[PDB]
Design a protein around this ligand. Sequence first.
Ligand code: HEM
Ligand code: CA
Ligand code: CA
Length: 348
Amino acid sequence: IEKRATCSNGKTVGDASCCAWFDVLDDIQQNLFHGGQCGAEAHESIRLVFHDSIAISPAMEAQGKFGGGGADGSIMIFDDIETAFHPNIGLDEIVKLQKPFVQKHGVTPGDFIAFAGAVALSNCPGAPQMNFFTGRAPATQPAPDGLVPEPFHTVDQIINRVNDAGEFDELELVFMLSAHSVAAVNDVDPTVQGLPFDSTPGIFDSQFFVETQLRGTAFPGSGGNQGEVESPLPGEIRIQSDHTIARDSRTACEWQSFVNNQSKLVDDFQFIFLALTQLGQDPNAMTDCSDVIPQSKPIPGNLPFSFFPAGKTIKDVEQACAETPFPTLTTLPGPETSVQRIPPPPGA
Ligand code: HEM
Ligand SMILES: [Ca+2]
Ligand SMILES: [Ca+2]
């Protein structure tokens, strides 16, 4: 039973219970995201949503074991346990920055993680208009390990894991990897933190899908780290799983479909992000508080939506989609330039 209501700030929302999230919004925009930025804390918050949510397994439950609660705030509640798992490396820092907000505002940890993830995305130009539903009860048990994918897992292992967790198919796997468009890597190369996956880590766009399809020619920092392969630009990192998903015959044409197609990118990610945040939950038992999330902003300027970074042309693309040739994009002018690092807070 939802009660449409006008909050104290004058805005109308779907249920009166949503109004209290406007105070949470104001607090995290100022004190967690430094004035609404799509910087390191926003990226970490988006990563935390996946690591809290994908830890659920119908297959383990069928074996008599607890397979995890899905989107239940378990990675925050039992952080001493889940953040020690190898796939969750580096997440205790963002969990520690978020905890005080959960305590101050009296919301569940699962609902806060889903909220901060959606607000973080709304700070990145180009993001979809994000949803936010409430209702996740506090987890009562930590998830098991072995449920969050690693960059060195094969494509078959990853496809099978997301299919078990939420009945997601191989095309939906590609949809959710769009989040690597606003993201950096702090713990794979031990000599440098903050290496972005694409040349625009503050913009939700398809440069991740363009740049992962170019030929990898060098390591940005040290060579041969586990789960890392060569990348095409100085300062950019590329992980093994993204590299192989982009070239596998099952997923390569879906990976290429986002290039120069902003509306598909936004619509597909909007859809799959909402689905991840409902894992382990009953959708009809949740409350829609999407009207609290800020409107996303357009990408500023007048460059084409997708482009080759300076120094790269169609000859540097490793075409993997047999149905449709990679689109001929324009190249930015000038010499190749390094992607700038995104320094993380201490402890990342
Ligand atoms: C399906 C398989 C995936 C694998 C193997 C994977 C792998 C990784 C790795 C290795 C990192 C760097 C972690 C670190 O250095 O501590 C990373 C970062 C990131 N991942 Fe994924 N990822 C996956 C899917 C996703 C999904 C579905 C999302 C959606 C939210 C996501 C969002 C992020 C974000 C936003 C970052 C950047 C973190 C930051 O800047 O601090 N990833 N991913
Ligand atoms: Ca969880
Ligand atoms: Ca980007």
